[PDB]
Amino acid sequence: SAPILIQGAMDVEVETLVAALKDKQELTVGSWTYWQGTLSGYPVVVSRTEVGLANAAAATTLAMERFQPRLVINQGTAGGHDPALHRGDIVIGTKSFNMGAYRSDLTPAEQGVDPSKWHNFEVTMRLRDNGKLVEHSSFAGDPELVGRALGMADRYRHGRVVPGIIGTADEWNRQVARINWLHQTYQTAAEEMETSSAALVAEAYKVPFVGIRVLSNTDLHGEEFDPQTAIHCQQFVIDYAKALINGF
Amino acid sequence: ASAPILIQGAMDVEVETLVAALKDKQELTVGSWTYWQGTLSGYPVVVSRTEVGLANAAAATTLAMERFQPRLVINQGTAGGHDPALHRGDIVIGTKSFNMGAYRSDLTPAEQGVDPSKWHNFEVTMRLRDNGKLVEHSSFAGDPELVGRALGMADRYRHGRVVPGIIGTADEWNRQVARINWLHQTYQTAAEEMETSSAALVAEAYKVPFVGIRVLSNTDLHGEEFDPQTAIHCQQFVIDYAKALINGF
Ligand SMILES: C[C@H]1O[C@@H](n2cnc3c(N)ncnc32)[C@H](O)[C@@H]1O
Ligand SMILES: C[C@H]1O[C@@H](n2cnc3c(N)ncnc32)[C@H](O)[C@@H]1O
Numbered sequence A: 001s002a003p004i005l006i007q008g009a010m011d012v013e014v015e016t017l018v019a020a021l022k023d024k025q026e027l028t029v030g031s032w033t034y035w036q037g038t039l040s041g042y043p044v045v046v047s048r049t050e051v052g053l054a055n056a057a058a059a060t061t062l063a064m065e066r067f068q069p070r071l072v073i074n075q076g077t078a079g080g081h082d083p084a085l086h087r088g089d090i091v092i093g094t095k096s097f098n099m100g101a102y103r104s105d106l107t108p109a110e111q112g113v114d115p116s117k118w119h120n121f122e123v124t125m126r127l128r129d130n131g132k133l134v135e136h137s138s139f140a141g142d143p144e145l146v147g148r149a150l151g152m153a154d155r156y157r158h159g160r161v162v163p164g165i166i167g168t169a170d171e172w173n174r175q176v177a178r179i180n181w182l183h184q185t186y187q188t189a190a191e192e193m194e195t196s197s198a199a200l201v202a203e204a205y206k207v208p209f210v211g212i213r214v215l216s217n218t219d220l221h222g223e224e225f226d227p228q229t230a231i232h233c234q235q236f237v238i239d240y241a242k243a244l245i246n247g248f
Numbered sequence B: 001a002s003a004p005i006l007i008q009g010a011m012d013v014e015v016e017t018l019v020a021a022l023k024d025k026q027e028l029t030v031g032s033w034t035y036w037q038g039t040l041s042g043y044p045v046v047v048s049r050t051e052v053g054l055a056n057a058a059a060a061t062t063l064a065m066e067r068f069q070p071r072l073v074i075n076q077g078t079a080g081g082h083d084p085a086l087h088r089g090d091i092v093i094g095t096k097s098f099n100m101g102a103y104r105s106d107l108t109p110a111e112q113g114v115d116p117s118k119w120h121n122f123e124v125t126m127r128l129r130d131n132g133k134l135v136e137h138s139s140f141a142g143d144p145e146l147v148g149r150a151l152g153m154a155d156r157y158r159h160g161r162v163v164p165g166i167i168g169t170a171d172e173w174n175r176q177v178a179r180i181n182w183l184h185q186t187y188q189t190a191a192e193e194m195e196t197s198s199a200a201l202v203a204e205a206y207k208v209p210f211v212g213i214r215v216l217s218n219t220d221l222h223g224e225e226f227d228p229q230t231a232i233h234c235q236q237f238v239i240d241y242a243k244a245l246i247n248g249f
Helices: A015-020 A053-067 A143-151 A176-186 A195-204 A228-247 B016-021 B054-068 B144-152 B177-187 B196-206 B229-248
Strands: A004-008 A022-029 A032-039 A042-048 A071-080 A090-098 A127-129 A132-134 A161-168 A188-192 A209-217 B005-009 B023-030 B033-040 B043-049 B072-081 B091-099 B128-130 B133-135 B162-169 B189-193 B210-218
Touching (some): A004 A053, A143 A209, A209 A228, B005 B229, B033 B054, B091 B144, B091 B196, B144 B162, B162 B196
Parallel strands (some): A090 A161, B072 B210
Antiparallel strands (some): A022 A032, B023 B033, B128 B133
16 A cells, blocks of 8 residues: 655646546645545555755655655656757656766866866765665666556657656756767766656665656757646656556 | 754764764664764754765755754754865854755857856755745755854864855865855855755755854865864864753753
């Protein structure tokens, strides 16, 4: 009877989920609202996380403490990093990582600022397990959960469903050269602001996790934000959750 | 039972002195986060080892709220100098903290390259909801009475100045001096570290008084490399500070 936890950051990324639940009960603690109900007769909790790494981690931790979910699906919209992808495509996160984590080597003021010399700062993803330090350079999507989403690709009719790497940061990048550099360096499919943070907390609690992100925008093709993509993503996720539930 | 003071540090060196100060301890670990529950001057205190960075800090703080319901939060530890007036061993009391790592940029085509001077602070990362209604935050103010108390205790600190300042939190360790200078000039930062504003965000959501207290363990503005002894010194000051609050309870 442990629920599926489904997350979205903004109201537009959760309202379609909420509408799908039967016998809803709403809970708000701190800044974070949860709707507890059923899908196909099975317990599901929808979480509106708010935006960014701190919010995502708090909302995920609070859900672990309150609901003890059996798996977490983090979803919502993202911006394209891979030129092959277009608005409406859905990325299933083979892995996510904190793309915004940076360490730089000492340079005197005369040398100016050069972000291309910044290194990914992996300590931000380091955890402890039974008190012992465990390094992480990324968080893998649960591979069975990833595979399931890919196997359901043809049920999504508003773009392609592809595996990719999700770069999480407290950033919205619109400098195309920066997007290109991040893609070349980290092989990112897309950027957003929550996935690796929720994933970090899921790893700490040893709960299976998958990130599912629709491209609502990509400055690589001049495609501006389309809020309807967030609805289409939730529709896919409802179908996906119901498939999991059929198998329970 | 009395609601505890919650005292946080990210790394072992930032909490071992606090933990040694508690009486009648028990140690609790959930997920990746360890807590020591005991007493200082007979009053309940929980010491939290948060691990490093914004996600860890927020998780550790949230878990503490759920498990322990503290009456106030002191987030402490070490930091790197951004203000050239400050040196290793000086302590900054956070008049405010903010997510210095949060960046938004306007559209530029590839040929214009990358320009971080055009990456603006992205305030949505600090936006919260209060009873379901959106509340914007461009920073989190340290509880002003807590901040004031720390400043009033300045001459009890034996190893440097105690000053008010702005704490810039980011999942970053900057050693490009031109970038440190740019951050200082843009945001009036005293120091940088990796947790404060994230713990502050959670404390604001829960409406629990919060103060950040950071010692400079390093500053590349003066060629001063990391000294771990500063972390011990900071904890000593924090214990004195906590005992003063407790006397007032
Ligand atoms: C503001 C909300 O929008 C998502 N989001 C959608 N597109 C982007 C993008 N190009 N860059 C960063 N975040 C994005 C964030 O993950 C966040 O939750
Ligand atoms: C790695 C630990 O060290 C702290 N810390 C100490 N000095 C710095 C600095 N110059 N920059 C960023 N973080 C620093 C972080 O807050 C983190 O917890």
